[PDB]
Amino acid sequence: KNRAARVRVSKGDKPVTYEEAHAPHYIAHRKGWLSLHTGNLDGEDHAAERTVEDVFLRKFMWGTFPGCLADQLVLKRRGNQLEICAVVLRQLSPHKYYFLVGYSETLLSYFYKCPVRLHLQTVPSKVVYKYL
Amino acid sequence: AYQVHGLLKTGDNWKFIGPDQHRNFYYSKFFDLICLMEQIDVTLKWYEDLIPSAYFPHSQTMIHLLQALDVANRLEVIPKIWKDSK
Amino acid sequence: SLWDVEFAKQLATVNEQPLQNGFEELIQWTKEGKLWEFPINNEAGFDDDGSEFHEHIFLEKHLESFPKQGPIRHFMELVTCGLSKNPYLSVKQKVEHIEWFRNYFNEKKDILKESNIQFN
Amino acid sequence: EVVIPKKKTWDKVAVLQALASTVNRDTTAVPYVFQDDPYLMPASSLESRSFLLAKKSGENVAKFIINSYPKYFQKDIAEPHIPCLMPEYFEPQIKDISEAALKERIEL
Amino acid sequence: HYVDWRMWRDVKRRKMAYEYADERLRINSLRKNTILPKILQDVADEEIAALPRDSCPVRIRNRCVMTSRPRGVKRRWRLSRIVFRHLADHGQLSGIQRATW
Amino acid sequence: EPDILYKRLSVLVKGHDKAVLDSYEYFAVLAAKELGISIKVHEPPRKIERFTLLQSVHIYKKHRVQYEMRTLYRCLELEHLTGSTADVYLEYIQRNLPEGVAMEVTKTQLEQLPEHIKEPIW
Amino acid sequence: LSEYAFRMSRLSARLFGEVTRPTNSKSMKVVKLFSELPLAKKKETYDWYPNHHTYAELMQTLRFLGLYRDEHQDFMDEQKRLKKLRGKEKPKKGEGKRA
Amino acid sequence: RRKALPPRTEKMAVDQDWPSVYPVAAPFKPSAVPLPVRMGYPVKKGVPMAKEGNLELLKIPNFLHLTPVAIKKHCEALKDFCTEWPAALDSDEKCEKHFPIEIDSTDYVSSGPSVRNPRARVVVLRVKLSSLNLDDHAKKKLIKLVGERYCKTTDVLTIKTDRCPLRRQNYDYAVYLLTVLYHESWNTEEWEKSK
Numbered sequence: 001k002n003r004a005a006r007v008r009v010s011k012g013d014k015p016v017t018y019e020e021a022h023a024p025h026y027i028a029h030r031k032g033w034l035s036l037h038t039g040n041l042d043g044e045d046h047a048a049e050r051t052v053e054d055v056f057l058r059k060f061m062w063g064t065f066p067g068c069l070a071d072q073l074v075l076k077r078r079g080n081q082l083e084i085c086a087v088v089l090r091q092l093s094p095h096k097y098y099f100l101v102g103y104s105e106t107l108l109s110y111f112y113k114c115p116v117r118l119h120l121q122t123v124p125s126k127v128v129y130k131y132l
Numbered sequence: 133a134y135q136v137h138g139l140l141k142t143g144d145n146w147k148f149i150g151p152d153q154h155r156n157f158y159y160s161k162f163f164d165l166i167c168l169m170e171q172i173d174v175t176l177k178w179y180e181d182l183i184p185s186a187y188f189p190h191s192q193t194m195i196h197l198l199q200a201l202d203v204a205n206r207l208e209v210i211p212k213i214w215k216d217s218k
Numbered sequence: 219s220l221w222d223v224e225f226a227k228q229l230a231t232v233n234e235q236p237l238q239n240g241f242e243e244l245i246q247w248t249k250e251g252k253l254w255e256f257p258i259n260n261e262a263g264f265d266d267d268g269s270e271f272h273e274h275i276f277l278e279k280h281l282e283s284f285p286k287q288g289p290i291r292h293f294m295e296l297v298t299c300g301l302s303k304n305p306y307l308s309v310k311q312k313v314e315h316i317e318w319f320r321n322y323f324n325e326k327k328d329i330l331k332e333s334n335i336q337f338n
Numbered sequence: 339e340v341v342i343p344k345k346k347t348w349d350k351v352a353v354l355q356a357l358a359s360t361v362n363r364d365t366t367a368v369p370y371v372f373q374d375d376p377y378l379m380p381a382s383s384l385e386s387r388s389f390l391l392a393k394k395s396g397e398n399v400a401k402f403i404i405n406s407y408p409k410y411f412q413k414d415i416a417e418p419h420i421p422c423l424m425p426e427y428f429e430p431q432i433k434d435i436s437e438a439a440l441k442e443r444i445e446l
Numbered sequence: 447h448y449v450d451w452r453m454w455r456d457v458k459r460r461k462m463a464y465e466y467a468d469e470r471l472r473i474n475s476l477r478k479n480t481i482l483p484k485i486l487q488d489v490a491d492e493e494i495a496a497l498p499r500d501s502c503p504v505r506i507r508n509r510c511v512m513t514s515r516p517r518g519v520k521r522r523w524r525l526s527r528i529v530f531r532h533l534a535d536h537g538q539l540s541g542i543q544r545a546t547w
Numbered sequence: 548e549p550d551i552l553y554k555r556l557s558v559l560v561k562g563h564d565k566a567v568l569d570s571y572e573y574f575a576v577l578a579a580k581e582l583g584i585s586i587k588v589h590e591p592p593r594k595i596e597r598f599t600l601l602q603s604v605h606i607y608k609k610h611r612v613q614y615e616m617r618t619l620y621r622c623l624e625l626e627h628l629t630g631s632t633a634d635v636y637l638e639y640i641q642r643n644l645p646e647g648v649a650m651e652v653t654k655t656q657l658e659q660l661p662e663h664i665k666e667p668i669w
Numbered sequence: 670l671s672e673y674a675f676r677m678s679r680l681s682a683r684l685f686g687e688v689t690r691p692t693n694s695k696s697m698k699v700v701k702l703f704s705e706l707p708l709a710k711k712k713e714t715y716d717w718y719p720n721h722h723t724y725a726e727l728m729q730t731l732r733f734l735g736l737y738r739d740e741h742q743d744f745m746d747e748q749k750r751l752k753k754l755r756g757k758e759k760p761k762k763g764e765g766k767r768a
Numbered sequence: 769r770r771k772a773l774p775p776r777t778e779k780m781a782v783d784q785d786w787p788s789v790y791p792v793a794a795p796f797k798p799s800a801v802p803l804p805v806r807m808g809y810p811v812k813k814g815v816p817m818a819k820e821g822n823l824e825l826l827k828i829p830n831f832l833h834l835t836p837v838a839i840k841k842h843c844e845a846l847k848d849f850c851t852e853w854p855a856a857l858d859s860d861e862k863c864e865k866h867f868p869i870e871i872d873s874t875d876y877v878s879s880g881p882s883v884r885n886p887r888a889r890v891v892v893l894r895v896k897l898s899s900l901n902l903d904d905h906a907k908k909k910l911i912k913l914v915g916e917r918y919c920k921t922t923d924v925l926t927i928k929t930d931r932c933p934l935r936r937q938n939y940d941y942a943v944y945l946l947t948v949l950y951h952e953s954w955n956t957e958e959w960e961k962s963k
């Protein structure tokens with residue numbers, strides 16, 4: 001019995017988003033890649049650096065903002081672009097959100113030595129696709 | 133007014149704002165003049181390009197907007213600007 | 219001049235201007251020196267310190283205290299032509315290995331004069 | 339036969355004029371330092387004030403956490419070295435000198 | 447906080463190997479020559495066996511940067527087959543998809 | 548200073564999907580026929596990297612999990628432009644470069660004659 | 670093959686950048702270990718692991734300054750709090766099997 | 769505490785130009801778009817998900833920034849840096865008669881701020897041999913001298929150079945190699961009679 005990071009529906013009581021409701025045998029079929037970079041094409045150097053940067057970036061961006069990610073990140077990547085567009089809960093003040101957006105801009109742009117502009121798309125709740 | 137407006141941000145944008153009060157005062161004065169002196173097209177342009185280009189209007193600025201809209205018989209978007217003022 | 223730098227900060231606070239589009243985000247991002255220098259090359263800044271091609275190829279100018287015809291000058295031709303075809307090292311590093319070979323090969327002159335042939 | 343045109347030589351400033359300056363100014367524009375998304379826009383000038391001061395106070399405590407640990411942002415992976423990426427130093431490296439110690443304890 | 451010593455000693459071997467590179471390069475340049483006769487090569491052998499341990503890239507073990515497992519490793523992305531499968535089945539690493547042939 | 552001239556130059560763009568660089572080749576071909584660059588469009592055959600990992604963690608060897616890696620190929624041949632104009636069209640690509648595709652630039656530049664090659668004795 | 674070829678190869682060796690007098694393939698081992706890099710110095714070998722201890726101490730200070738909320742260490746100090754709260758905590762430096 | 773703001777979707781009128789709306793390559797905030805397009809594998813008795821919360825719209829790039837009229841505007845503002853390929857040099861035989869030597873370059877791109885590429889330093893030199901003043905022994909000597917570097921069929925000598933990491937340096941090196949090859953092609957040496 002294969003169980004990936006997919007959803008195992010217990011009752012009609014679990015609000016699930018579009019992303020978690022697709023198993024990784026649907027990736028080229030019905031889904032989209034979270035990050036996108038040319039590091040996996042051939043030929044290309046600097047691959048494992050790109051992966052450790054994505055993993056540390058996503059775990060940092062989650063563990064900093066407490067519950068302020070409705071889903072995982074979108075790390076589009078174009079040379080000197082580490083472009084953030086995430087989906088946040090409409091709970092807290094936008095003053096605090098701009099504080100934290102500038103905070104992540106400064107910290108990431110001085111840690112990984114790259115121009116970063118953040119973008120947010122606020123969502124009023126957890127986004128749901130299925131009660132699965 | 134046309135001189136400071138053409139010098140505002142098109143040619144050289146040094147003539148915009150050093151403070152926040154500079155932008156607020158220049159926008160408020162030009163918007164009140166364009167509302168109570170000009171016709172309805174320029175007042176709609178002020179509602180699109182000074183009050184919407186900067187943030188919301190002041191109290192006397194909202195009174196000038198309401199009086200200029202009562203000159204041109206437009207009391208339909210009074211509540212959105214009222215929520216902007218409150 | 220400190221009042222001149224305060225004058226430049228006066229220049230900043232008069233010439234401050236807001237952004238209006240993503241072209242203007244890239245205006246700030248381009249004049250800040252951040253992004254690459256488009257259109258892109260790959261030799262930008264990493265330049266091997268302006269050496270000519272003949273400073274890579276012709277390395278006879280580093281081989282003074284060495285013999286002429288024999289086994290050890292053949293060994294030095296081999297390491298010279300080895301450092302010739304290496305583009306992962308700078309010419310300064312290549313002369314550093316050259317002087318290490320010279321210092322070592324005249325350092326242990328006991329067995330090299332036991333070798334029944336004279337090394338210079 | 340063969341004409342050879344002499345090179346028109348330009349810089350990064352020319353592509354600003356060529357692609358960025360051929361845009362218009364936005365009708366409904368809030369100043370673009372903030373986001374465009376509907377929940378986080380300002381509706382008053384006090385909102386923009388606290389937004390921009392939130393951004394710059396995050397930047398200030400960010401530069402404070404950078405200079406409180408200068409040994410954490412020194413591993414360089416980028417090649418062409420944008421110069422704003424290293425912290426600034428308030429330490430003196432000269433003590434037995436006199437004018438260098440005075441300059442490196444006051445102006446540095 | 448780091449906890450372990452197999453991973454830390456492999457990083458030890460990596461950095462002390464990075465130090466002892468050009469010296470062993472010159473000694474093995476003295477080694478592999480049909481010219482430059484035998485006793486020079488033999489004192490070179492004395493020298494290179496007299497070098498300290500943790501100084502040769504023979505010892506290098508390409509372990510994982512996420513779980514430090516010696517075996518089942520991709521050298522393309524420098525991590526284990528478990529954690530690569532973890533982040534691949536989640537869908538973050540671009541281009542890698544599950545093969546439907 | 549006179550200009551460096553090219554008889555030909557090439558930007559090869561390759562990605563993970565097909566729609567992005569088909570739409571990008573449409574952008575490039577209209578940027579070509581709208582600036583007089585005269586390119587063609589051509590597709591080299593694909594490569595599929597397919598490697599294999601263990602599925603279980605302790606012991607189930609007969610069941611494995613394959614991961615594909617599709618690599619597509621989409622080239623252009625850029626002819627008969629000078630150095631400045633090549634900087635124009637190369638800038639208009641590399642200011643609009645996507646996040647999933649690649650780029651390989653190979654110009655074929657021009658030169659008349661080496662110096663001491665006319666009638667030389669060293 | 671004769672010295673016509675040997676002289677053509679020798680002059681193309683002085684020309685194109687190969688060694689002019691002939692040698693063994695065992696001695697061409699030194700020119701191929703000199704025409705490239707040693708193993709240790711490549712940017713993907715000694716920097717296989719990034720300096721991971723900087724990442725760990727970075728997150729440690731960010732948790733200590735309360736800027737990062739490290740749930741794993743909150744949970745670990747919770748279970749350690751319960752473990753010291755029960756009556757079975759760590760011995761002191763000098764107490765152990767010998768008590 | 770809690771606020772409530774509508775988007776610019778009702779705010780922007782029908783005739784606002786898209787270079788003012790979408791200038792540049794966007795991460796697609798759906799506040800600004802007035803276009804109601806859905807994407808997703810939909811449920812059976814339901815709908816594909818709309819643009820709000822649509823991460824599938826966030827990973828997939830829009831081409832809305834490349835407005836074709838704005839492409840045209842940026843092209844006609846980019847008329848100034850241009851030159852002209854001169855009309856005597858259109859048919860490629862005449863281009864070879866005026867320039868028979870071609871130098872290739874290499875440049876790539878990479879995801880990430882690091883710029884270096886190891887395979888971007890070779891400049892292969894391509895000379896069609898029928899444009900030179902090569903005499904008979906001289907051409908025979910050049911063939912004997914280069915060996916396999918010269919394509920015998922269409923008469924193109926091809927010389928690769930990667931002994932140094934700079935493009936101009938290897939280009940001067942290939943030019944130097946051609947220069948000393950065309951030193952050597954004339955000179956009949958002492959053993960060339962001992963053939």
Ligand SMILES: [Mg+2]
Pocket residue numbers: 001002
């Ligand atoms: Mg099964």
